[PDB]
Amino acid sequence: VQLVESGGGLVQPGGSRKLSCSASGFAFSSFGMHWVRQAPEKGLEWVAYISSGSGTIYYADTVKGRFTISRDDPKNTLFLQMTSLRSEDTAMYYCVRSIYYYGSSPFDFWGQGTTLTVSSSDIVMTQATSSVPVTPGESVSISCRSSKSLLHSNGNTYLYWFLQRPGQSPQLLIYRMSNLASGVPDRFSGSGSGTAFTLTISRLEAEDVGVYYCMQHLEYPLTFGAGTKLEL
Amino acid sequence: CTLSAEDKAAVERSKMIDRNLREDGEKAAREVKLLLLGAGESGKSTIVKQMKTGIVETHFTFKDLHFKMFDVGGQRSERKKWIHCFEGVTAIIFCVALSDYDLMNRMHESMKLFDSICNNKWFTDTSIILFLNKKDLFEEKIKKSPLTICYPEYAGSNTYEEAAAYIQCQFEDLNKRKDTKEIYTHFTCATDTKNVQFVFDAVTDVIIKNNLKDCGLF
Amino acid sequence: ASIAQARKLVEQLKMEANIDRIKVSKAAADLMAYCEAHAKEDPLLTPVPASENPFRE
Amino acid sequence: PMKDYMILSGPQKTAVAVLCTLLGLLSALENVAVLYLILSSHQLRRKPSYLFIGSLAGADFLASVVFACSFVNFHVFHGVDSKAVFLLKIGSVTMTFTASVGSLLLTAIDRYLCLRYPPSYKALLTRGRALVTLGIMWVLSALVSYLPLMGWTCCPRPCSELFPLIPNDYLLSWLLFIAFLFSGIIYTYGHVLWKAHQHVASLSGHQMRLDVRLAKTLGLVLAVLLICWFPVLALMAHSLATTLSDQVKKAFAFCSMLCLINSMVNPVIYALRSGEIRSSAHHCLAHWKK
Amino acid sequence: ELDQLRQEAEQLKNQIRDARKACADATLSQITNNIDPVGRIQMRTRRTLRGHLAKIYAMHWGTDSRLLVSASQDGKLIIWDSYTTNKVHAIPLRSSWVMTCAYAPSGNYVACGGLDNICSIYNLKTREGNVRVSRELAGHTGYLSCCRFLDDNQIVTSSGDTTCALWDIETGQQTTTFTGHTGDVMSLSLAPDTRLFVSGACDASAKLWDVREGMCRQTFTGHESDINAICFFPNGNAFATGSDDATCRLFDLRADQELMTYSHDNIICGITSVSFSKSGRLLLAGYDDFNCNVWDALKADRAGVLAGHDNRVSCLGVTDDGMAVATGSWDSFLKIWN
Ligand SMILES: CC(C)(C)[C@@H](CO)NC(=O)c1nn(-c2c[n+]([O-])ccn2)c2c1C[C@@H]1C[C@H]21
Predict the structure, then answer these.
(1) Taking a C-beta distance cutoff of 8 angstroms, is the pair E120, E145 a contact?
(2) What CATH number is given to the structural domain containing C26?
(3) Does the C-beta of D20 come closer than 6 Å to ligand 1?
(4) What ligand 1 atom has the least distance to the C-alpha of D70?
(5) Rounded to whole angstroms, how far apart are CA atoms E194 and E210?
(6) Which residues contact B30 (CB under 8 A, 6 or more apart)?
(7) Is B190 flagged in the annotation as binding?
(8) Residue D101 to residue D52: CA distance in whole angstroms
(9) What number does CATH give the domain A126-230?
């Protein structure tokens, strides 16, 4: 399974570009694919989403009416037509599959990302620790704090924990809290209080040196938290 | 609506599954299923080659109508415990060999297979499409010996027109449900080529008469 | 040959005959005592309230 | 003005009145009986073809009660019958004598898809498709029938003397509407009998009883439809040419009782022929023997 | 001589029957005479699961008691979310003739089997978002009537070749072959500790197989017709056999014999499906007369009736937490009766 995207480069400010995410290695027509960008010195922000069979389509506040998402289920590729590119659109656009059923793991595989560079009521997450001093082997704790209680009526608490290793794409660690992404080690566990949350890493290692993002999924727009960078 | 962002997209996955369930169910509703139930190994392998693991489905298509023929005789279990899966089949393609009357008796064994399947409680309305195979081999068996070996109570003479009309009437006798179902008899062999055309003519009388129970016309 | 099959029927019935059977007055008191001990954990015997019932339709 | 356009009285007035309630109540007792056998069996309502027989029994039940309440009011009661309310009473009987005839076309097309496309008939017509063609039948039959009460007066043109307070050109426009709905029946029920003779001659060419079973049923359907409706609709077309100096308009009020005779014979010929209605009639009594 | 082998089998059948008569001092109906009855048990249909288009032949809840797989003869194997009635998965099979389905206790695998003499195991939780056939277990020479997951590696299938077998999934192979029946093994059921399992065949007899040993421990010749379904008491020391002669009968393994008979005179058609509730006080049978009876299991008398199906209830299963009961009938509808 892999997701490789194409587009970007030096765009004139106010121009247009098509970002094409070509999906190879999975059943593409059943995954409701997102687009998530990353500013050159900031954390992630969610950009666009298209469902399975292109039923529902959402955008952020910045790109509503300015971008346009579309998927091609026979050709196994996903598009993002953006017009009138402002200078605040310079980013690196990831392409995130997310299937939704009961017990699924959304946001599990992320694309590699294409550095776009133009020329020149939301649930506000807050990761208060911008950086944590870290010694390898000890137990570190990353605390995320919501601005609305993510605990829904059906028992689920839609908070997702991502890890972005330096030079890589964000990997899903923990879906709806105290779950575990199929493929990450046992040392990650997330114990939250419905509105204030915690990630626990037990036996730390240099593979866990990175940035940790807490992501709500209660309602659109999917507000990501800021960066919690862990440094040796 | 009190549904979350994931529960709204778990319903849309269900409603997209419902679309693929109807579009694959309406595709399989336009197909004709035909439980082929030839008794023994006589005549059953002839008409699958003419018209083209325990159950051997032989798919084929004639005049934009897709037939499924579930040759199920390779099961060798108790028949009463799985024959209700074939309830709601469009027809039943029985196969009798005409020349097995010299070969209890083999012809009488294929009447007990017919009597136990035409009065079954699941097949009270599925019309048997009875195929009397081995016709071009039935003629020379008659001219070498009469029908009186198998049938003791035979009044007509030996020749083929009275013998073959008698074995047609012996198998159209074993049904007690003369009003709900019908028996479409053909007289085939290996050299015939109309046996794909007869099934299409016989199931189109079945589905027409099955449709005229639905609109209350019959 | 049925000499090797019907002997297997005998060795099956010889192996089945050697089990110690407790009496019915003992082996049905336990089916009574398992039903009384676990009676509170049954949501079909005693109707669970609608707050704890996950099927509310 | 509403009273004197029907001059019919005398010794016949009891026979015009009691025939509208003996044939009016039994048609009401028979149409709700079929409407109860379909809706309470609850395996017939999911079958999409009994909705056309059921709505025929629904369009006929209102065609029997409103023709009961309007006709004895007009001949032996002689009510007030003002300008605005009577156009409802003449429209509510025309809607239910068009939606009944429209249901016979709607079930003929349904019986045409049984034979034109035999194997895919369950996929061409489902319960969802049967209700959307039943909905557009009921509002189109209401729109062409409730025409003069929304806007019409018969101010510039002579309006017809058969039906009081009703324009003559709309009678020319309503008759030709039904004349396609009749031509949609005789061409369909003639094409059911033609696509079956093509098939019976094709099966029996290898080695008649399907056609004669159809023509004994569809022939009587076309016989019981045309020996009563055409006496209404032949002289209704004759009313436009000559203004009927003699008492042909007297004979129409007797001949307009034929379309109530056509009411109770519709569940006898359509629903009592159905072997599942016959089976559900003997199954529903065993529920009610207690 | 062959005629001496029928004799010493009968003299060994006598001492089994004599020791069966030696231990019957009082019946279970004698002990539960002065016990408070459970009254009328009325369960309403909470969910009705649409979407199937043919006759539903089996269902199986998950251990989480929220997901149920449900096989039917339209060639589909739908996985339901039982709380909010969504289809999690719709698995198109290689053939429509499916007579059983299973659900692994972990949740990752689903096995359906049918008239193809084959058992095909599906993979739910995987990458690529598909449900693909993990393994196809061939080797049975009859219709595969019930398959039950021991764990994610082993599965016990019951075929109509008078043989149950124990499969290894990671290499599809019959580990042990459970022979001894003389009829089509219609349904099996696993003990809660899964060291034993029972299997009721078409020779009016259920057995008790040691899974790890390979042999048959006990033979429960009590019925008189085909045992169409079977289930365990939750203690694991008793089981109940729905038959074709309309009598569920509760046996028990320690007393080696029959305890009760759930016979009523108003029913003449057999039982397609038996499942105890949690705590084993109710015995929900599934009949051919469009019905489901909630028998008391200490007393014999009928407590409630689950009516509301338009055709034969072919399968029922109470959840592992005992909260609900899903009876999938021959009309294309599952119904969940809390
Ligand atoms: C005025 C009434 C008391 C209602 C009586 C006449 O005494 N009227 C009818 O019985 C009657 N009127 N129509 C009719 C009337 N209009 O105006 C248009 C189209 N049809 C029809 C009938 C039955 C014929 C079926 C069509």
Answers:
(1) no
(2) 4.10.260.10
(3) no
(4) 3
(5) 9
(6) B66, D119, D120, D123
(7) yes
(8) 11
(9) 2.60.40.10
